[PDB]
Amino acid sequence: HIDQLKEREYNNYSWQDLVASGVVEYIDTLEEETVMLAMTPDDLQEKEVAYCSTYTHCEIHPSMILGVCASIIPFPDHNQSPRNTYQSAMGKQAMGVYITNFHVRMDTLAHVLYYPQKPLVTTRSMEYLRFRELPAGINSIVAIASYTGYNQEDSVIMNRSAVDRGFFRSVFYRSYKEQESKKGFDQEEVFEKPTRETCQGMRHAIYDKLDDDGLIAPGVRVSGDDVIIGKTVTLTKRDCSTFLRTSETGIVDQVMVTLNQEGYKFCKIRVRSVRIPQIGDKFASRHGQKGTCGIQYRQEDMPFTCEGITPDIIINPHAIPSRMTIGHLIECLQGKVSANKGEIGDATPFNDAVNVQKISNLLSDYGYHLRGNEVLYNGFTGRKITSQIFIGPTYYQRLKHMVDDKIHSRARGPIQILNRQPMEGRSRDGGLRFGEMERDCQIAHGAAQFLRERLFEASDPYQ
Amino acid sequence: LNGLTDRDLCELNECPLDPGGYFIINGSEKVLIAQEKMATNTVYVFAKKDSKYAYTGEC
Amino acid sequence: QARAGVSQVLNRLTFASTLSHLRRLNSPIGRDGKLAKPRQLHNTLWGMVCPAETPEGHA
Amino acid sequence: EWNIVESEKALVAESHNMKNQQMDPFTRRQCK
């Protein structure tokens, strides 16, 4: 069967042949309780202490239990279950090429990464998950250490030169939808530049930026509170047009115009934005080691090995013992081995032939410490560091939780209509909620004046 | 796109890598989550204690 | 009166997310229940449901 | 194809060098 299957594709041999031949069998959860399952065919049947010797079935491969997001995790069994679950939930938030035909799609909130490299260590399961073709991360030379202190409580230090060369530099799109319709007998919408004379309702923004058709042309500079579509509804006309959301500051990619099912002019516009990786952006590896970039140093300041190899990311050593993520260390070691050899390594969860000792022995055959530690130098003074740092390639991701999309402020912004209190939401330019727990804390501090100010003066004065 | 070669898919502004199996309503990808429930036509004998019955033969 | 969340927007943020979303389940039990027996990973979920991939919030 | 032949040669080589396997970081269950 193996020979006939290895020659598939070429002739016509497929899984149906195995099923019909009577070699495999579908056992459902209700029947699985009445069969003596076995893990591996060779190990659990040879001849030893008589355990059962009545196996009816045998699994294909133990690692197949994992799902989709868990499979991409290298060495999951070498890590504690909560961190595997955190990685499985965070994998879905990793950026990259989410679909090859992204330039044709007009979805809302699309992120794409420039150089999505492939993991240096790939499990045998992701070969079918299609991850290698559409990865979501870059292999970075990570050095677990505490260089300065900006990477202490779950934080990292990225290389400014690396970012300059395009390290994890992704893009941010933002599509729009807007169409005209017959509101009423007298009401009617139409795309047209709202001039300074006929249109009564109008915004204090620039309008000549777009063409006469009323749609901003592609590849034009835009910023917050700028008109993107020239819609004007006749009452003379009211500027019932949309504007780019505050704190977006992008460039228009392409403009699409068409007719909807009703037959009115329907148009979509998407604006891109080159998001340079800056401090505050959330990153994460394939083991649950989340974190935010604290500070970025240039190459001259970062440490360096015996040759010019400066770390690209520096996580906190203290995040390892409490969380017990030895799988991450094994990944780093195997990645160093793979890079030195020059071929992707195997990180299958259960393999019975990938331990640490053999990997270490391989790594010792290239002029590097068998445990992966190496001697760095203080990037500032140039004195060797007493402790031999542990540096090596490792596959890291980038989440969409950018700092610019979360930063918010307020200073007597718009007010609601029902209860004259500030709005809610960054997009609507609202203020934070001074929850009841904050009130209790302030009462505990006894600062009655501050409490009354927050609840009356800067909330909703009225006589 | 039933059994269509990758050539046409590429020519139709689509990719052969898309898993598919998602509806398109009003230009939005809708997916049906697989809901789970209790198997029908099977007898279950529970032992609810916070009631007047010692055993309950639900079916 | 009917259920909610049966048809969700397919999260097209990365191919892994698309694969995960297209093969996701959801129990009909009420959200944030005091009980803790249905949430716990049961022994029968061997090779059928990933024992690691799952949210970490209230669900 | 080269990866397939590489895997096959690795398997046959692993089968050949069956002299001794004394390693510290590995274990397996043995019930009863």
């Binding site: 065919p41 197949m64 | - | 694969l19 | 398997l11």
Partner: peptide, 28 residues
Amino acid sequence: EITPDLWQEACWIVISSYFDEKGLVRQQ
């Protein structure tokens, strides 16, 4: 003939065939 020892490679050919014949979202 049985396949002793040399089984790690033949363990994944079956998986490759299965995923080629049936897709990931085949159930839907």
